[PDB]
């Protein structure tokens, strides 16, 4: 786990053989990570839309471990001010908002 | 409630005598709402930081009801692509991430 929100909900992830940190972001539809070298197929994707668009590489069905939970989901790889775990992967780990 | 994340976590809020909808956004430090007239004191605040800054009005200790929970917190008022409930108010309502 239960994570309070007094601080930014940053968690450890394992992806592409690397240990990283990322923000659990319920405001983000998608997961965007930088500085990861993923194997297998990708396609370009345009995201954002403020000031222009940002182009990222979309990798589907990527195995990823998020705070101990091994799941699978789409990961967008490209520049991002902060590594972000979006709703697409929070659903996979069974993460809910509770109050 | 327990809110799953397959869809955007949009909730009803009551603010400044108006009913509105806003996104529960654990990636946002602050709460930003558009098209609300709040009474009482404010100061300008610069937020964002990509492409420049956005100036908003900071109102402190604003009463707000979020999905039935009457709380108090800082509300930033300014045009925002989407109304956002940030961590500052999610803490007030006792909202946690759980998995």
């Amino acid at each position: 786990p239960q994570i309070t929100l007094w601080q930014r909900p940053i968690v450890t992830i394992k992806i592409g053989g690397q240990l990283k940190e990322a923000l659990l972001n319920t405001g983000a539809d998608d997961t965007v990570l930088e500085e990861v070298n993923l194997p297998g197929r990708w396609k370009p994707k345009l995201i954002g839309g403020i000031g222009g668009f940002v182009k990222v590489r979309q990798y589907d069905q990527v195995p990823i471990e998020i705070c101990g939970h091994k799941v699978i989901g789409t990961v967008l790889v490209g520049p991002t001010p902060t590594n972000v775990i979006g709703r697409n992967l929070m659903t996979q780990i069974g993460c809910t908002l509770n109050f | 409630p327990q809110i799953t994340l397959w869809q955007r976590p949009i909730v009803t809020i009551k603010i400044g005598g108006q009913l509105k909808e806003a996104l529960l956004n654990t990636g946002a430090d602050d709460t930003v709402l558009e098209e609300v007239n709040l009474p009482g004191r404010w100061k300008p605040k610069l937020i964002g930081g990509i492409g420049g800054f956005v100036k908003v009005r900071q109102y402190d200790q604003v009463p707000i009801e979020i999905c039935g929970h009457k709380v108090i917190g800082t509300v930033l008022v300014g045009p925002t692509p989407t109304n956002v409930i940030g961590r500052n108010l999610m803490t007030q309502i006792g909202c946690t991430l759980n998995f």
């Binding site: 972001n25 983000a28 954002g48 902060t82 972000v84 | 956004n25 990636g27 930003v32």
Partner: peptide
């Protein structure tokens, strides 16, 4: 912070 994605 103001973190997002839509997209």
């Amino acid at each position: 912070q103001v973190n997002f994605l839509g997209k």
